[PDB]
């Protein structure tokens, strides 16, 4: 998607699932899917506080996931940590995922981005 | 997000919810939530056939949604039609949504995009 469209869809997404998350948490407890969707929107946000919150929400889901869900959670932990420039954490997550999903070229392109960013720092 | 990142995350999402949708479909019927989530990914895809399928899935959810859900469906119907260059349909959808959500500047910005592309 072009940039302006991507940004406005991102905002609409985040606001919808924030409402849903805040509604459910007001009504007692938050379903696993609602927490994941909100966290997924948070790690794509333009605000760093949002990304940090999405990471926390993904860490809370991680021990309760099926094996397939845990793979999805680790993907977005690497995304969030990469966007925060927590490169060594992101790199550890995506390498672990690639061991169990070797043909995941999305995870591979993410690893390439993380490596490229660690090179331009000089920290690789 | 930057362009390369946005594209690989879009692929990861689509494939994840395609598996969820197809697995629920084979097992009988598909939940509202999975059909929407798959449609949401499809409308954002780089393939026109995907966008068209997302519009179909959204059109099928629309008669049976609540008031709030319908407004969200119409937003993504506007997005998908805009990306397919179906500008008259897209403008109609977003103008309806703006009548009931007047403070929704994301819908407003989408309307400006539709209006720009029509004048291009
Ligand atoms: Cl279809
Ligand atoms: Cl509003």
Numbering used by the authors:
A (entry chain B): 1 to 124
B (entry chain A): 1 to 120
Question: What did the published study say regarding this structure?
Answer:
Unlike phosphorylation mimic mutants, the WT Fis1 crystallized as a non-covalent dimer. We rationalized that the α1-helix and N-terminus structure are intact in WT Fis1, making Cys41 unavailable for disulfide bridge formation and hence WT Fis1 could not form a covalent dimer. We observed that the concave hydrophobic surface that is known to mediate protein-protein interactions in TPR motif-containing proteins is between the interface of the dimer in both our current and the previously reported structure. We therefore hypothesized that the WT dimer observed by X-ray crystallography was an artifact due to crystal packing and the dimer of Fis1 should be different in solution. The modeled WT Fis1 covalent dimer fitted both the P1 and P2 symmetry enforced ab initio envelops independently calculated from the experimental SAXS curve. This evidence indicates that the Fis1 dimer that is present in solution is not related to the WT crystallographic dimer; these data combined with the data from the non-reducing non-heat denatured SDS-PAGE gel suggest that the small amount of Fis1 dimer in solution is indeed a covalent dimer. However, it is also possible that the differences of WT Fis1 dimers in solution and crystals may represent different types of dimers that enable interactions with different protein partners.
A tetratricopeptide repeat (TPR) motif containing mitochondrial outer membrane protein, mitochondrial fission protein 1 (Fis1), mediates mitochondrial fission by recruiting large cytosolic GTPase, Drp1, to the mitochondrial outer membrane. The cytosolic domain of Fis1 is composed of 6 tight α-helices with two anti-parallel TPR motifs forming a concave hydrophobic surface. Fis1 interaction with Drp1 occurs during cellular stress, but not under physiological conditions, suggesting that cellular signals during stress activate Fis1. Human Fis1 protein contains a single cysteine, Cys41, in the entire protein.
